[PDB]
């Protein structure tokens, strides 16, 4: 009853990342007492919150700094994209409407002081800044971090690397900002950036940086912002997404009628790993194949062909092993997103990986 319910809850959660739970540890033993309490509607009233406040999470990055190609490329990571001014210009996510990435001027081409440069650009509508570079920090930028943490607000230090398509990371930051630690005091990192793969330097790290300190209700959204181009990037998305179901099967308590309903959900999840039937047009045909002949290959299209209603019932009993049951919508979801984070990854090397599917099964279903 309500108390394996709290303690299934309770062994859900510990399964991911700190940086990626999309509710805190806070809202977590709240949500466990009231269920123990059996106060069970004002449980889901919580859950209700929790996910009202994920769903509609605005997102407003700054990004300040002096103009240039390694800047506005990392705008443009921001936003998904892969390709004299004294105003702030918004640059709006393509995908996800509640994410804004703001061009701030750099504050050493404007006449401000610290304080008068971030009450000019309005500092209080963002989530945090990121103060960036191609060349080296100046004593004007640390200033500017100072006032910033003075607000009680976030910076990051981004330093942009121009690159073709060890130790050259530690030159470089040798080279941009020896003399940081000098003007702040506590000892700030910097992230170095390629400006044309985000699997290289300090990016993984970064992306693990800001999930930590965002709002626990901004996680999902952040995660969802960045173009699927990494096993990394891709499972924050994968953890966002499954965290973001459980929460949906909590509060709600014919196979094929259901997956009909679930088309759309399942199209919305394929955009989000880049699955989307473009984005396969596109790499069947760098393979000189059928796309149809190119997804014979990836185990998404065919999830749902041993009968299937068999097959659920045992997939089934495995999530359910460290008894709490969902709604059938809840497994569906579930597997079509682990397997759709699989074939995403082995999509990052696809023609080498042809060398019947490119990749892994999802946990628990083909054994």
Not at 32 to 53: C, F, G, H, P, W
Request: aromatic share 12%; proline share 4%.
């Amino acid at each position: 009853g309500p108390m394996a319910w709290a303690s299934s809850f309770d062994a859900f959660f510990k399964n991911f990342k700190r940086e990626s739970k999309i509710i805190s540890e806070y809202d977590i033993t709240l949500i466990m007492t009231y269920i123990e309490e059996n106060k069970l509607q004002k449980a889901v009233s919580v859950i209700e919150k929790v996910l009202r406040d994920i769903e509609s999470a605005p997102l407003h990055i700054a990004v300040t700094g002096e103009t240039g190609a390694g800047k506005s490329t990392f705008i443009n990571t921001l936003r998904g994209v892969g390709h004299t001014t004294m105003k702030r210009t918004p640059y709006p996510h393509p995908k996800l409407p509640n994410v804004t990435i703001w061009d701030l001027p750099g504050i050493g081409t404007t006449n401000f002081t610290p304080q008068n440069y971030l009450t000019e650009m309005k500092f209080g509508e963002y989530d945090f800044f990121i103060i960036i570079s191609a060349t080296r920090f100046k004593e004007n930028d640390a200033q500017l971090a100072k006032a910033i943490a003075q607000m009680g607000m976030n910076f990051y230090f981004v330093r942009t690397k121009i690159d073709s398509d060890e130790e050259v990371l530690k030159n470089i930051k040798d080279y941009c900002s020896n003399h940081l630690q000098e003007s702040l005091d506590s000892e700030p990192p910097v992230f170095l950036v390629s400006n044309v793969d985000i699997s290289k330097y300090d990016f993984p790290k970064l992306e693990t940086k800001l999930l930590q300190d965002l709002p626990a209700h901004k996680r999902h959204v952040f995660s969802l912002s960045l173009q699927s181009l990494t096993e990394a990037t891709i499972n924050y998305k994968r953890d966002s997404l499954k965290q973001k179901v459980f929460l949906e099967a909590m509060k709600a308590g014919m196979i094929s009628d259901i997956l009909e309903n679930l088309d759309e959900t399942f199209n919305l999840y394929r955009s989000y790993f880049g699955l989307d039937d473009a984005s396969l047009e596109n790499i069947a045909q760098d393979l000189n194949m059928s796309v149809d002949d190119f997804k014979v290959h990836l185990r998404f299209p065919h999830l749902f062909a041993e009968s299937l209603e068999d097959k659920l019932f045992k997939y089934i009993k495995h999530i359910s092993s460290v008894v709490t049951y969902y709604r059938m919508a809840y497994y569906l979801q579930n597997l079509f997103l682990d397997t759709a984070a699989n074939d995403a990854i082995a999509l990052l090397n696809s023609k080498a990986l042809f060398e019947p599917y490119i990749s892994e099964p999802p946990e628990y279903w083909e054994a």
